[PDB]
Amino acid sequence: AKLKNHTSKNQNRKDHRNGIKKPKKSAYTSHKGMCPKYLRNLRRSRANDPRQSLRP
Amino acid sequence: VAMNPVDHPHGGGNHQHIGVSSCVPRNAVPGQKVGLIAARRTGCSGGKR
Amino acid sequence: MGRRIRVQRKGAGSVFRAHVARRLGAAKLRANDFAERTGSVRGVVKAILHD
Amino acid sequence: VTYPAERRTFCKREGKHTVHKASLYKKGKDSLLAQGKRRYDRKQRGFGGQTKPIFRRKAKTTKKQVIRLTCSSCKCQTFQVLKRCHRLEISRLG
RNA sequence: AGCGGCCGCCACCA
RNA sequence: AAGACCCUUUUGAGCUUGACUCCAGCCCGGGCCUGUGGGGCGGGGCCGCCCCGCUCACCCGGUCGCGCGGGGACCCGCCCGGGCGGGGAGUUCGGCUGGGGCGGCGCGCCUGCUACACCGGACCGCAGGCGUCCCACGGCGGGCUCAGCGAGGACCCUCCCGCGGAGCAGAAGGGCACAAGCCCGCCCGACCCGCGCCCCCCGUGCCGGCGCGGGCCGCGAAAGCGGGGCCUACCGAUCCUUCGCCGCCCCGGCCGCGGGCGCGGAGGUGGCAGAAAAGUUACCACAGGGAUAACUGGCUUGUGGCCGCCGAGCGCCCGCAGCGACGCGGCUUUUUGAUCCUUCGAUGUCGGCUCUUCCUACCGUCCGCGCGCACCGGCGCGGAAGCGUCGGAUUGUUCACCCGUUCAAGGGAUCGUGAGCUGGGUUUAGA
RNA sequence: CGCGAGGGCCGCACCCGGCGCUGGCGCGACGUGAUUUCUGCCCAGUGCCAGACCGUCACCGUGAAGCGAUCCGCCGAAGCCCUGGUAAACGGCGGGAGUAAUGACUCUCUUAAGGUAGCCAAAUGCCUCGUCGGGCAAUUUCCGACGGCAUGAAUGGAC
RNA sequence: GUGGGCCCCUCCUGGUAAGCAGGACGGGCGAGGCGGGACGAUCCGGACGCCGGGCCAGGGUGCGCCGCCGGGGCCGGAACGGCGUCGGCCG
RNA sequence: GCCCGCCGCGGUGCUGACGCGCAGAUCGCUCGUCGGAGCCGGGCAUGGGGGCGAAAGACUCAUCGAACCGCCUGGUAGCUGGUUGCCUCCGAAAUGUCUCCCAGGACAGCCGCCGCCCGCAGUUGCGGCCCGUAGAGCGCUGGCCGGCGG
RNA sequence: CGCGCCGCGGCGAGCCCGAGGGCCCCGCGGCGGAGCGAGCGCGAGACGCCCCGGGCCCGCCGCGCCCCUGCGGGCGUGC
Ligand SMILES: [K+]
Ligand SMILES: [K+]
Ligand SMILES: [K+]
Ligand SMILES: [K+]
Ligand SMILES: [K+]
Ligand SMILES: [K+]
Ligand SMILES: [K+]
Ligand SMILES: [K+]
Ligand SMILES: [K+]
Ligand SMILES: [K+]
Ligand SMILES: [K+]
Ligand SMILES: [K+]
Ligand SMILES: [K+]
Ligand SMILES: [K+]
Ligand SMILES: [K+]
Ligand SMILES: [K+]
Ligand SMILES: [K+]
Ligand SMILES: [K+]
Ligand SMILES: [K+]
Ligand SMILES: [K+]
Ligand SMILES: [K+]
Ligand SMILES: [K+]
Ligand SMILES: [K+]
Ligand SMILES: [K+]
Ligand SMILES: [K+]
Ligand SMILES: [K+]
Ligand SMILES: [K+]
Ligand SMILES: [K+]
Ligand SMILES: [K+]
Ligand SMILES: [K+]
Ligand SMILES: [K+]
Ligand SMILES: [K+]
Ligand SMILES: [K+]
Ligand SMILES: [K+]
Ligand SMILES: [K+]
Ligand SMILES: [K+]
Ligand SMILES: [K+]
Ligand SMILES: [K+]
Ligand SMILES: [K+]
Ligand SMILES: [K+]
Ligand SMILES: [K+]
Ligand SMILES: [K+]
Ligand SMILES: [K+]
Ligand SMILES: [K+]
Ligand SMILES: [K+]
Ligand SMILES: [K+]
Ligand SMILES: [K+]
Ligand SMILES: [K+]
Ligand SMILES: [K+]
Ligand SMILES: [K+]
Ligand SMILES: [K+]
Ligand SMILES: [K+]
Ligand SMILES: [K+]
Ligand SMILES: [K+]
Ligand SMILES: [K+]
Ligand SMILES: [K+]
Ligand SMILES: [K+]
Ligand SMILES: [K+]
Ligand SMILES: [K+]
Ligand SMILES: [K+]
Ligand SMILES: [K+]
Ligand SMILES: [K+]
Ligand SMILES: [K+]
Ligand SMILES: [K+]
Ligand SMILES: [K+]
Ligand SMILES: [K+]
Ligand SMILES: [K+]
Ligand SMILES: [K+]
Ligand SMILES: [K+]
Ligand SMILES: [K+]
Ligand SMILES: [K+]
Ligand SMILES: [K+]
Ligand SMILES: [K+]
Ligand SMILES: [K+]
Ligand SMILES: [Mg+2]
Ligand SMILES: [Mg+2]
Ligand SMILES: [Mg+2]
Ligand SMILES: [Mg+2]
Ligand SMILES: [Mg+2]
Ligand SMILES: [Mg+2]
Ligand SMILES: [Mg+2]
Ligand SMILES: [Mg+2]
Ligand SMILES: [Mg+2]
Ligand SMILES: [Mg+2]
Ligand SMILES: [Mg+2]
Ligand SMILES: [Mg+2]
Ligand SMILES: [Mg+2]
Ligand SMILES: [Mg+2]
Ligand SMILES: [Mg+2]
Ligand SMILES: [Mg+2]
Ligand SMILES: [Mg+2]
Ligand SMILES: [Mg+2]
Ligand SMILES: [Mg+2]
Ligand SMILES: [Mg+2]
Ligand SMILES: [Mg+2]
Ligand SMILES: [Mg+2]
Ligand SMILES: [Mg+2]
Ligand SMILES: [Mg+2]
Ligand SMILES: [Mg+2]
Ligand SMILES: [Mg+2]
Ligand SMILES: [Mg+2]
Ligand SMILES: [Mg+2]
């Protein structure tokens, strides 16, 4: 009629069993959420740099 | 009232009793038209003519 | 929700038909015809019977 | 509960703030030629009773009133939804 | 929501 | 004998009705069937009703068609429309839960505590709150300082000190002084277009919040600030309906109506990730369940029952012959609860009768001591379980209550004992 | 209680049937249950019924508009609504305070009406093994009395 | 596949309490052979292929039943009582 | 529709016998009724949501709170039972969220296998920020015994 | 029988015993090759061993500026 409600008894062991993972190396440098005005200026400067540009 | 409810609309109950009024209307369907059919009045009182 | 009640079963007939065996017949006046329609006709009482 | 008779706010048709007059929005009457109504009628033809559900278990004692704001200069309509409330009236000053 | 004058009668796909 | 009691299953059935959704049947109206004439009323400038002759349709009688009738353009029948309609049909009748039900609502949210100083952490745990209220009780700028204590003033005014002891809509916690409070002035950022993040979290949705790019504005000398009301709660998918921008389509063409589509709001699901839904069964069921009650047993001992410690008092005097308040410490499982471990493909479920054995917390008898023990008769204690503890009236009774006698303790053994009985009670189907 | 045959109640898919070889001293539907003595109050609720067309309430029909589909008006049968009747229809039938140990008397709140005549710890009384009398040596049983958890008048009361 | 868990040690909540009910880090049984705790799923050691030798953990060493001697002392349960015996502290 | 009482028709008590029966309802003794709403035989009629019922939900061929026969039908079951050779290598969960969910599922976690590619840690030390529990205490919010001095 | 993923065989900007017709011979669709947009419709080169990320191009939604055949073309900016 009544069963158990809650435990976290085995959960820290399950959490450790494969090691604690780390997020990908490129999420630290994702542009997402940065200022768009800064991102615009970045694109202009590289686009007009003759050593950095990739225009054909 | 001496019957079971399957046999008659007056049947059943822990005391023998009809349960609702036994004046039924004129346009009741067959199976319903038991008791006193379309009675102008009821009871036993004197003084008619 | 029920069965058919007693008044509903009487219309079909069967065991609820009239007991007519050994009845004398249907009781009627004499049929109106020319002679009664224009005059009078005579009869004689032959029997008085229980039906 | 009390709403100004008149308000100055943005208009899209002109692209700048103008003066608008308030009124109360109300749902219009149902057409007989809307497609869902046509489908409902065709499904309800014949024997078999009710073919769609009928909502019973009702809880809210309040709807969200919406104000129509009609632009004075050009007659562009805009709507403002208000928080739930029990009584509402618009002021009367034009 | 619909007629009439708190009331009648009527109506009902999120 | 795959419990029939009890519970669960999105398994039934009989019965009921103000459950939900309907069907026969009956009542009512127009139309067709359906002729041939005469009249009255009203309206609009031909139309709608109403009435009453005739016989020839249609219908009813009598007669062996033996020397005859009655109704009548109405009734029936048919089509469509409205009402009555458990007589009948199909189906439904939430969940959590120290068994279910009555009750309650941690079923969607919020504060403090439980919670053991990152985060997280249960209960029908504790103390409570939410479904609202405000064009100002909102935005901005300026000025001001609150609650009060003390001291003064004819029968509210003034000074002085004043860390907030006031106020800031409503629970609680947090926050705030040339302010976030109060007063004055002007206002409507309680706007438009397009993105991202936080909380909850499966890193899905929903409420709520935060950070931006671009329009258009408000207040301010200006720097600034502003997408409501200081912060933590105050709310809602698909399909359908309704409304508003700018357009696109209707597929052989074009035009006008109309219909549809892309974007956004509103109408609501509180059982709040959102079926459209009333009872009864003592006539009964099906699949299962010891995941779960009713009876033995087990743990516990509040309640019941029994035993100690202390010594205010009682006892003519005299705390302890006999007693012993206010307190405190234990034992037992012969009461009743609390719980749900074993048993639902079944452990026969009250008492009495019959018969046997056991315990001692000893009522009479035995052996010792004590007395408020002269005798008699009573009372208190230690050892002691051999023998004894009975006959009847009323009650199914265990119990109790009375009468009588050689004067009459208390218990256990599956609440000993139904292939030993009996069947009074309880405990199916009749009434 | 209903019905005078062009009817009523019932059967029945349709055509056609039963009561009926019948006619109110009849046929059909219900309740109570020999005799004797009786059968009180309530039409507010629910049910049934008849008398008027106020509101509401169909299709058909008809007016105005329109390119048309269609939109809007008018018209208005039965039913409900309104006005009454009916309890041997279903059913229902009282509180507080005093006042000569009681309470004939009174004041008051209140209902549609406030349980009459009767009967009773009853096969109906919880408390309850009620109180008193009879009977017994002794009686939770029995009989006679007294007066209501929740007695009572064709739910038929009492004998 | 699983989404009925349970127990121990420490830390807690309701309850007179419970082999009662509800939570927390770590470990165990579940799904862990062997020896020991007389006897027990979980305690004390130790966690496992088939054998021969050696060393020994936990517990123990009168006989059942594998294994011992030496030395120094003494001789289930509450409040409350004891001039039983051996040892102390304060006067 | 009187009384005693035989055959007949019925079925009270013994809660008798039997209860692996003589028997899927029988036997013994006792008992109700016996001129009548009495008992018996044949023919005929009424058919399943129907009949028939002096009414017990009774009876309708050992079947009745809805007969029997064949088919739809190997009806559906989140529920109970069972599910057949060997060795080797690995090896769990009994938890979170949603669900007419609570004896069932979906997503996540935990595990197996198949791969593909080129520093790390369930630890200590050193350095920097964070927490409000045990203890302590009465300044804050509350509670609480008393004694001096004016 | 249908859906997903993995392995292996043949051929590869291609691929393929439909049905049918003369274990052999001939044999259409279809799928792939371009996407995005409700739809009118418009329509991809710029980089790279491989993988991941950056940049830029195409469509849908919005907006500067110039023009030819014009609510049409070109060139740009933004999520
Ligand atoms: K009845
Ligand atoms: K029924
Ligand atoms: K029937
Ligand atoms: K029937
Ligand atoms: K019927
Ligand atoms: K019948
Ligand atoms: K539409
Ligand atoms: K229908
Ligand atoms: K079973
Ligand atoms: K069962
Ligand atoms: K059962
Ligand atoms: K149960
Ligand atoms: K059951
Ligand atoms: K089932
Ligand atoms: K069911
Ligand atoms: K049944
Ligand atoms: K049923
Ligand atoms: K049944
Ligand atoms: K009905
Ligand atoms: K049902
Ligand atoms: K997650
Ligand atoms: K929120
Ligand atoms: K912005
Ligand atoms: K919606
Ligand atoms: K849907
Ligand atoms: K919409
Ligand atoms: K079963
Ligand atoms: K179960
Ligand atoms: K179990
Ligand atoms: K168990
Ligand atoms: K105990
Ligand atoms: K149990
Ligand atoms: K038990
Ligand atoms: K059982
Ligand atoms: K047994
Ligand atoms: K057993
Ligand atoms: K003795
Ligand atoms: K009557
Ligand atoms: K009679
Ligand atoms: K007399
Ligand atoms: K009488
Ligand atoms: K009345
Ligand atoms: K009346
Ligand atoms: K009435
Ligand atoms: K009386
Ligand atoms: K008596
Ligand atoms: K009465
Ligand atoms: K308790
Ligand atoms: K293991
Ligand atoms: K293990
Ligand atoms: K000592
Ligand atoms: K005889
Ligand atoms: K009998
Ligand atoms: K015998
Ligand atoms: K027999
Ligand atoms: K006789
Ligand atoms: K018949
Ligand atoms: K038959
Ligand atoms: K049947
Ligand atoms: K059948
Ligand atoms: K068959
Ligand atoms: K068949
Ligand atoms: K079947
Ligand atoms: K099932
Ligand atoms: K099942
Ligand atoms: K089986
Ligand atoms: K839910
Ligand atoms: K359900
Ligand atoms: K679940
Ligand atoms: K289930
Ligand atoms: K699964
Ligand atoms: K303090
Ligand atoms: K092929
Ligand atoms: K588009
Ligand atoms: Mg991991
Ligand atoms: Mg009966
Ligand atoms: Mg009935
Ligand atoms: Mg404008
Ligand atoms: Mg069974
Ligand atoms: Mg379920
Ligand atoms: Mg059912
Ligand atoms: Mg439940
Ligand atoms: Mg804010
Ligand atoms: Mg009974
Ligand atoms: Mg159990
Ligand atoms: Mg005790
Ligand atoms: Mg259990
Ligand atoms: Mg047995
Ligand atoms: Mg036995
Ligand atoms: Mg027996
Ligand atoms: Mg009677
Ligand atoms: Mg009575
Ligand atoms: Mg336990
Ligand atoms: Mg052993
Ligand atoms: Mg030895
Ligand atoms: Mg006789
Ligand atoms: Mg006789
Ligand atoms: Mg099968
Ligand atoms: Mg089957
Ligand atoms: Mg391994
Ligand atoms: Mg679990
Ligand atoms: Mg739901």
Short mmCIF file of C-alpha atoms (C1' of nucleotides) in Angstrom, two decimals, chain F residues 40 51 53 69 134 152 189 268 314 368 375:
data_model
loop_
_atom_site.label_atom_id
_atom_site.label_comp_id
_atom_site.label_asym_id
_atom_site.label_seq_id
_atom_site.Cartn_x
_atom_site.Cartn_y
_atom_site.Cartn_z
"C1'" G F 40 -66.86 36.49 -42.68
"C1'" C F 51 -66.22 29.21 -40.88
"C1'" G F 53 -72.85 23.38 -47.64
"C1'" G F 69 -77.61 3.34 -43.73
"C1'" C F 134 -3.52 49.68 -7.21
"C1'" G F 152 7.34 73.95 27.56
"C1'" G F 189 9.53 52.24 -20.12
"C1'" G F 268 -9.41 26.64 -20.21
"C1'" C F 314 -3.41 8.65 60.71
"C1'" G F 368 7.30 -20.79 62.43
"C1'" C F 375 -9.73 -16.01 76.18
#
